[PDB]
Amino acid sequence: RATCSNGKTVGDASCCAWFDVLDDIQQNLFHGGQCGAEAHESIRLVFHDCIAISPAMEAQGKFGGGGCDGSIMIFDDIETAFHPNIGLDEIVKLQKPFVQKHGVTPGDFIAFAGAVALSNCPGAPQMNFFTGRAPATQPAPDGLVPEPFHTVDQIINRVNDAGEFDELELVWMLSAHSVAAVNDVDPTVQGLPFDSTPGIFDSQFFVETQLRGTAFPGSGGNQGEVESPLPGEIRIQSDETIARDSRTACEWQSFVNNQSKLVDDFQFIFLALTQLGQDPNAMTDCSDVIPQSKPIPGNLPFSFFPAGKTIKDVEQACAETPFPTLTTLPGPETSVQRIPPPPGA
Ligand code: HEM
Ligand SMILES: [Ca+2]
Ligand SMILES: [Ca+2]
């Protein structure tokens, strides 16, 4: 343990340089510490860097990808052209100059920016940050990042190969869709959120994906898109099916009205994702650099039905426990506002 020049204690004096990186990204990437487009894009970038590993491919003498190696940045012209990585070159290009200026590894930076991004979102867990990711030497193969039109079987199998993650852990990692929008699936409109609170790390994603889908927020006929339950909200087929599948439905529902489980499980699974490709015992704990997460503001219940929705609108899929009869916000059904992204998204 060491004390940095700012008086903060950290796991190791090598962590102290990350306070310079923190100040720089908070002002110049996240527009003063916001949980907006760049924050959401950085959270997604962690998954797409890290899940690109495959012990199964390696066991046939094929490169399976290095996991959290910064390969999606170092080899951006290759990986960001893969279909599942659509729209990520925009955030890669915004991140690159910080990596160059601060002399940090591309994989460490991607993990850092994802943790800082989440710390900006009220309700987020206290996010971890470990260092020790050598620069990738090969780009990832394609076919390693899940698609919204993939089956539940293949997504379960994919995350079990990548990280020995089981079907329950697949549900936890999809909590990231609580602070997320879709730029590229609907060719007519960018920035359609997955839940009605894309600035808030909460279980609205788990509530709202359980509702009956009533309309497309924009165009119909988009591969891997299904009807959503609110105007301005997007829903993808993978989320819709995982929420109703007999293996995962009860786990999905368990996050409704359970902030502690949402926060504790996502803290765990995020750190696990950021260690793919690495020996955790070789890494340095710089978690004390990450800002203290903020609580959800206001005095409303943690989970709620959006205005215009009640228990009658829930497609209850959990045979163990009934979907909880939440409160319904007052007034007319309200449109979820789009989050316009930076150019090239
Ligand atoms: C496992 C199956 C998953 C599928 C099929 C999936 C699919 C999607 C799709 C289709 C989008 C919109 C992408 C675009 O339009 O460019 C998206 C956005 C996003 N995903 Fe996922 N995802 C998955 C898992 C995860 C995980 C595990 C995380 C993070 C831990 C994550 C974080 C995000 C975030 C933050 C966004 C929003 C990006 C933005 O606001 O620009 N996703 N996801
Ligand atoms: Ca990678
Ligand atoms: Ca949310």
Q: What is the resolution of this structure in A?
A: 1.5
Q: What is the CA radius of gyration of the chain?
A: 19
Residue with tokens 């009533």: 214
Q: Looking at the CA of residue 159, tell me the nearest atom of ligand 1.
A: 1
Whole-number Å distance between alpha carbons of 135 and 277: 11
Whole-number Å distance between alpha carbons of 36 and 25: 13
Q: Which ligand does the CA of 36 lie closest to?
A: 1
Question: Is 48 assigned a catalytic role?
Answer: yes
Residue with tokens 């015992």: 281
Whole-number Å distance between alpha carbons of 328 and 317: 20
CATH code of the region 12-145+270-297: 1.10.520.10
| Residue nearest ligand 1's atom 31 by CA | 44
Query: Phi then psi for 235, rounded to 5 degrees?
Result: -135, 135
* Residue partners of 105: CB distance under 8 A and separation at least 6: 70, 99, 131, 133, 134, 135
* Residue partners of 42: CB distance under 8 A and separation at least 6: 29, 91, 95, 110, 113, 114, 116, 117
Ion ligand 3: residue ranges with CB closer than 5 A: 178, 195, 197, 200, 202, 204
DSSP string, 259-283: HHHHHHHHHHHHHHHHTTTS-GGGS
Q: CA separation (Å) from 293 to 21, 93, 184, 267, 336?
A: 18, 27, 29, 12, 24
Q: Reduced to 3 states, what is the DSSP secondary structure of residue 226?
A: strand
- Known binding residues for heme b are 177
To 10 degrees, what angle do helices 88-102 and 18-28 make?
140
Are residues 109 and 95 in contact, defined by beta-carbon separation less than 8 angstroms?
yes
Are residues 46 and 276 in contact, defined by beta-carbon separation less than 8 angstroms?
no
CA atoms within a 13 Å half-sphere pointing along the CA-CB vector of 195: 26
Question: If 0-12 CB within 10 Å is exposed, 13-18 middle and 19+ buried, where does residue 325 land?
Answer: exposed
Q: Where in the chain is the domain with CATH 1.10.520.10?
A: 12-145+270-297
- Known binding residues for Ca(2+) are 49, 67, 69, 71, 178, 195, 197, 200, 202
Separation of CA 164 and ligand 1 centre (Å): 20
Nearest to 303, CA basis, from 188, 174, 209: 209
Q: CA separation (Å) from 161 to 71, 156, 274?
A: 19, 9, 16
| Residue nearest ligand 1's atom 37 by CA | 180
Whole-number Å distance between alpha carbons of 331 and 326: 16
Q: Which ligand does the CA of 240 lie closest to?
A: 1
Buried/exposed 227-241: b ≥16 CB within 10 Å, e otherwise:
ebbbebbbbbbbbbb
Give the residues surrounding ligand 1 with Cβ less than 6 Å away.
Answer: 40-41, 43-44, 46-47, 86-87, 146-148, 155, 173-174, 176-177, 180-185, 236, 238
Are residues 173 and 156 in contact, defined by beta-carbon separation less than 8 angstroms?
no
Whole-number Å distance between alpha carbons of 158 and 234: 24
Separation of CA 19 and ligand 3 centre (Å): 28
Nearest to 192, CA basis, from 343, 341, 339, 35: 339
Whole-number Å distance between alpha carbons of 195 and 230: 9
Q: Give the CA dihedral 69, 88, 337, 207, nearest 10 degrees.
A: -50
Q: CA separation (Å) from 159 to 92, 145, 148, 178, 262?
A: 23, 9, 14, 20, 19
Beta strands in the chain (DSSP E): 2-3, 9-10, 130-131, 181-182, 192-193, 225-226, 235-236, 284-285
Q: Give the CA dihedral 89, 90, 92, 94, nearest 10 degrees.
A: 160
Buried/exposed 108-130: b ≥16 CB within 10 Å, e otherwise:
bbbbbbbbbbbbbbbbbbebbbb
Mark residue 320 as left, alpha or beta (left: phi above 0; alpha: psi -120 to 50; beta: remaining): alpha
CA atoms within a 13 Å half-sphere pointing along the CA-CB vector of 80: 20
* Residue partners of 182: CB distance under 8 A and separation at least 6: 191, 192, 193, 194, 234, 236
Nearest to 127, CA basis, from 43, 4, 53, 12: 43
CATH code of the region 146-269+301-340: 1.10.420.10
Separation of CA 107 and ligand 2 centre (Å): 8
Neighbouring CB atoms inside 10 A of 327's CB total 11
Residue with tokens 């279980």: 203
Separation of CA 4 and ligand 3 centre (Å): 34
Q: Where in the chain is the domain with CATH 1.10.420.10?
A: 146-269+301-340
Whole-number Å distance between alpha carbons of 121 and 33: 9
Whole-number Å distance between alpha carbons of 115 and 233: 25
Rounded to 5°, the CA angle 336-291-254 comes to 50
Separation of CA 177 and ligand 1 centre (Å): 6
Whole-number Å distance between alpha carbons of 86 and 68: 19
Whole-number Å distance between alpha carbons of 104 and 74: 13
* Residue partners of 75: CB distance under 8 A and separation at least 6: 136, 138, 139, 140
Provide the greatest CA pair distance for the chain: 60
Among residues 40, 48, 83, 102, the one annotated as catalytic is: 48
Are residues 96 and 33 in contact, defined by beta-carbon separation less than 8 angstroms?
no
First to last CA, the chain: 40
Q: Reduced to 3 states, what is the DSSP secondary structure of residue 108?
A: helix
Q: What one-letter code names the amino acid at 124?
A: A
